[PDB]
Every structure is written in structure tokens, then in C-alpha cells.
Amino acid sequence: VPPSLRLPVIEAAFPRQLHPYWPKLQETTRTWLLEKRLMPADKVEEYADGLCYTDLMAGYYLGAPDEVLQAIADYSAWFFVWDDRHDRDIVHGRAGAWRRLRGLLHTALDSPGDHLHHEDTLVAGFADSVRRLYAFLPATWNARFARHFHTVIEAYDREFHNRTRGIVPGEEYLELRRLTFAHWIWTDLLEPSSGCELPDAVRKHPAYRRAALLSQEFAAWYNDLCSLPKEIATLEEAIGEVRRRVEECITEFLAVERDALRFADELADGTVRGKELSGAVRANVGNMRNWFSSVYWFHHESGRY
Ligand SMILES: [Cl-]
Ligand SMILES: [Cl-]
Ligand SMILES: [Cl-]
Ligand SMILES: [Hg+2]
Ligand SMILES: [Hg+2]
Ligand SMILES: [Hg+2]
Ligand SMILES: [Hg+2]
Ligand code: NA
């Protein structure tokens, strides 16, 4: 990894983790992509061939039930397809087609059941992915996921118009840039991964919230850092500033992580409920931590494509 991009702290203090179910994700996701006809057989094969977003997810949502990880993996593959459609609409100036897709996604997000077989396979695949994600936790969690994802769709829309007018956001085979738009969604998905919808009071506790924010912000700043040196294909001090912000996300997270785990201790009051909430907080925070190493190494490995 380039010295300019290297993070000795991540390498030393954030050991990579891999979900035990990882080996089984590939074939299932391939089957799903082909079944929903999300991409032509050959495009599926390319995406399924090497590194893909499932690898990011499998180093992140540790402890997730197998079915939850599978659902998240398929959702991440859907993201790849959406990104491709997004780019294509932009390149071809298909403003109408994009606007209509934007509308259908908002609609399918709130009502996936009656969109499972939409003529647009991207929408059909989206609806199925969301339906499956909605099957794990109570409707209150589903509604929050939806609330957050509506915002993500609008972020893509903003980008569509920016890029349509010559503004270059950041090509990259397996970019993380647009994925960071879904920062609240990744945070939401920690919950079905530990099997509990956290009460507002717990997930809005300052230590939990801050840990969650910093985990995601790290990836945003780091994506900035990795983009700068590509300018070649002032600079040194521009990198310097972004680098300090990346390092600050990490050290700030380490501090708030300690606070979050103390909070978890407090939740474990001896009752089964306390034990469940405590365990879920610890698992979620642990995965907020795993995000650092998963992102860091995913970027490095993606550079081989
Ligand atoms: Cl795949
Ligand atoms: Cl990145
Ligand atoms: Cl910062
Ligand atoms: Hg894949
Ligand atoms: Hg719970
Ligand atoms: Hg990066
Ligand atoms: Hg930061
Ligand atoms: Na966030």
C-alpha cells in the first residue's frame, strides 16, 4: 500500500475479521443476480469472479446470522448494479429515465411486495432485496431503514444533476464513494446483524451515536485521501490535512469505543433484557470497529482490479 495511503494504526490495532459464512455467499448471490436478471449472465460472472462488495460486508457484519449476511451481501451486489445504471444514465444524459427510476425506488422501498416483478429488473431486484431485509426485525426498524434510504436515493439524484453539469464527484471498478452515501443504512444494518432492534434511547446514547458516526466518517475521509494522489494520472500538504482527519477519526473512535463499551456494561444489569441489549451494543460497536479494517483492506485489494 502506498505510503501516502498507509495507516499503520489500522494495520496494528484493527486486526481483520472474516465471517465464517463467507465461503457460502458467492454461489447464492450469483444465483440471485441471475434469477432476478439484474445483469446479463456475463456481467454477473465478471462481478462474481473476484473481489466484490460481499468481501467488504463479510469483514464488517461479524456475528450476523447466515440469512442476514446473505441478505446484506445480495443488497451490496444490488448496489453495484444501481451504481452502473446511475453511471449509464448520467453518461447518456437520460434525465427522464433516471427521474422515473428514482421515483420507482422510493415507491418500491415503501412497498416492495408489489414490485417484486417490476418490468425494470433493477427495481424488481431492489424490491426483493428490501423485502428480505424487512423480514428480520419489527416494522419500526423497517420504517427507519426506509426513512434513511429515501435520503440515499435523493443523494444519488443530487449527484446525477451535479455530474450532468460537468462536476466530477470522484472511474473505479469497486468504488466506495457512493456506498458512503448509505452511511446511516450501514449503521441500521448492524441491528439485524446482532438480532435486535435497539431502542431509541440506546442507539441515540451519545457514545453509541458518536462511535457510529466516526466509523462511517472514517471511510468518507479515507476515500478523499485515496482520491488525491490519483490527481497525477499543494498535493503533499493537501494529503497532509486529509491524513490528519483520517487519523483523528480513528483515535476519536478508540476513545468513544471505550465509552460505548462502558455503556454496554451498564446495560448488563443481570436481567435477560439487559443482557440482550448489552450484547447487541457490544456486537454493533465491534462491527463499527471492523468497518475500519474491512474498508482499509478492501480498498487495497480493489486496487488489483
Ligand atoms: Cl456474486
Ligand atoms: Cl475508501
Ligand atoms: Cl475530523
Ligand atoms: Hg460477489
Ligand atoms: Hg433487543
Ligand atoms: Hg480509500
Ligand atoms: Hg475525522
Ligand atoms: Na451516518
Task: Write up this protein.
Mg(2+) 3 binds at residues 223, 227, 231. Belongs to the terpene synthase family. Mg(2+) 2 binds at residues 83, 87. By secondary structure, the chain is mainly α. The protein has a single domain (1-305), classed as Farnesyl Diphosphate Synthase (Orthogonal Bundle). The protein is built from 14 helices and no strands. The chain is globular. Bound molecules: chloride ion (3 copies), mercury (II) ion (4 copies) and sodium ion. One chloride ion is lined by residues 26, 29-30, 47-48, 52, 77.
Q: What about the largest sheet?
A: none
Integer tally of domains: 1
Tell me the total number of β-strands: 0
Query: What percent of the residues sit in helical stretches (DSSP H or I)?
Result: over 70%
- CATH fold descriptor: Farnesyl Diphosphate Synthase
Order of helices and strands: HHHHHHHHHHHHHH
Distance between the termini: 14 Å
Corresponding CATH superfamily: Farnesyl Diphosphate Synthase
Structural class of the helix and strand makeup? mainly alpha
